[PDB]
């Protein structure tokens, strides 16, 4: 039981600490459709990305409470969920902003009040 909260086009990268370089996740360079998914029950989240060409899954990691998500530039973001470092090299600023905005919201919901909001603008 999952819901996509955003969809963003990006080249998905991992850092190769041995060779001191970023390498394309899954071994093949190219853009991916990168989602953040919310498990409606657990109230957990995860980033999932698939290559656009061959639909290979290149990232599939859960978003832990307390993740340090870094926007190096407006269009390259990075974090280290596990032992490796992940990067997202976005196709456009529009893509970068939606993904960052969804990630921030995910991290709030994981982090844990306010009066109800006003009506949406007419």
Residue numbers in the entry: 2 to 113, 120 to 129
Please share excerpts from the published article on this structure.
A peptide from ENAH interactor ABI1 was among the highest affinity ligands that we validated by BLI, with KD = 2.6 μM. ABI1 contains an FP4 motif followed by four prolines. We solved a crystal structure of the ENAH EVH1-ABI1 peptide complex at 1.88 Å resolution. Only the FP8 region was fully resolved in the structure under the crystallization conditions, which included high salt and low pH. The peptide folds into a PPII helix with prolines 1, 4, and 7 (0FPPPPPPPP8) contacting the EVH1 surface. The FP4 portion of the peptide binds the canonical FP4 groove, as observed in other structures, whereas the 7th proline docks into a previously uncharacterized site on ENAH composed of Ala12, Gly92, Phe32, and the aliphatic part of the side chain of Asn90. We note that residue 12 has diverged in EVL and VASP EVH1 domains, which may contribute the weaker binding of ABI1 to those paralogs, although we have not isolated the affinity difference to this specific change. Notably, a similar binding site at the analogous location is used by the Homer EVH1 domain to bind the phenylalanine of PPXXF motifs. However, this site is relatively shallow in ENAH, and modeling large aromatic acids at this position on the ABI1 peptide using Pymol leads to severe steric clashes. Homer contains a smaller Gly89 at the site of Asn90 in ENAH and can accommodate the bulky Phe of the PPXXF motif.
